């Protein structure tokens, strides 16, 4: 099996439900802390394009 990265995340947010190993189609979900408003969505997931990796999109950000 192939395993997705951790990844090094995130600015102004927090992790909900952290398992150490991320596999196929499993999504990370990041809530921004109390005092920051959204820029875009929350949850990205893992993809496969070659035999290694990878993640699907860019990480979110929050303004406040």
């Amino acid at each position: 099996e192939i395993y997705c990265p951790a990844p090094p995340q995130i600015d102004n947010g927090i992790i909900q439900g952290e398992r150490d190993h991320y596999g196929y189609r499993q999504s990370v979900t990041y809530a921004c802390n109390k005092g920051f408003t959204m820029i875009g969505e929350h949850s990205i997931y893992c993809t496969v394009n070659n035999d290694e990796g990878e993640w699907s999109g860019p990480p979110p950000e929050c303004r406040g």
Binding site: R25, E41, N49, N50, D51
Partner: protein, 251 residues
């Protein structure tokens, strides 16, 4: 009117913005007659226990989406007594009723093509390389076309403008189809009879057809609208019968 209600087995489906019902090539699904049949055994015909609306998993319509394809009956292989009668039997003959449903709003826009392609033989991503049997069709998750060409070593060709088979994607409208136009339509339903050159065949080494849905006009809304519209498929077998009871497969 614009309302229709389908009731198969113990489960029913109601719609309120339904265009019509496209009954395949003009054929309602029927049983095998006594002069088209070949197998000399007695078939088992479960009426209510099999023919009902098994719902799949709901896929997400991204704004950058490309399309998705399911492959039947192997996409119905772990649902109910369908996936149990498929193991204990060599043959199998059935028609289907496929109900693709997607509601967003009157402030969203987008248009899907919902087609049922008989025997969509798919070309390889990298040629002179036989691709995997799970990169064509996993058991429950759909599959996804790519936005550009594929460079996989053991997968199919997932460029959506070539529809996987190698034809122009706009020429798919001879296979029995509908559209889900979020301006008017809400749900597309196709009644597909059993299409094969043999009366009954195996269920595991042969995908009788392929349900492809493809967003032609992409999903675009306001940034303050609902940023998650799902697409659920609710497929039901019809007039199913199986033959040649042996031990459980499928090796």
């Amino acid at each position: 009117d614009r309302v229709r209600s389908i009731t198969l087995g113990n489960s029913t489906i109601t719609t309120q913005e339904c265009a019509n019902v496209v009954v395949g090539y003009g054929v309602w699904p029927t049983y095998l007659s006594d002069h088209e049949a070949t197998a000399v055994d007695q078939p088992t015909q479960p009426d209510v226990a099999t023919c009902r609306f098994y719902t799949l998993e709901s896929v997400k319509w991204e704004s950058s989406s490309a399309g998705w394809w399911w492959k039947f009956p192997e996409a119905l292989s772990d649902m109910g007594l369908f996936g149990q009668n498929m193991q204990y039997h060599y043959l199998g003959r059935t028609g289907y009723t496929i109900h693709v449903q997607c509601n967003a709003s009157k402030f969203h826009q987008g248009c899907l093509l919902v087609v049922c392609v008989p025997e969509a033989e798919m070309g390889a991503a990298t040629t002179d390389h036989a691709f995997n049997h799970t990169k064509l069709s996993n058991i429950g998750q759909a599959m996804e076309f790519s936005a550009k060409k594929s460079t996989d070593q053991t997968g199919p060709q997932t460029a959506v403008h070539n529809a996987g088979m190698g034809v122009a994607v706009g020429n798919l409208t001879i296979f029995p189809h509908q559209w889900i136009n979020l301006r008017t339509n809400n749900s597309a339903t196709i009644v597909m009879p059993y299409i094969n050159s043999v009366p009954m065949d195996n269920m595991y080494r042969h995908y009788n057809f392929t349900l492809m849905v493809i967003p032609f006009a992409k999903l675009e809304h306001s940034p303050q609208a609902s940023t998650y519209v799902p697409i659920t498929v609710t497929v039901a077998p019809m007039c199913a019968e199986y033959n040649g009871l042996r031990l459980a497969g499928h090796q």
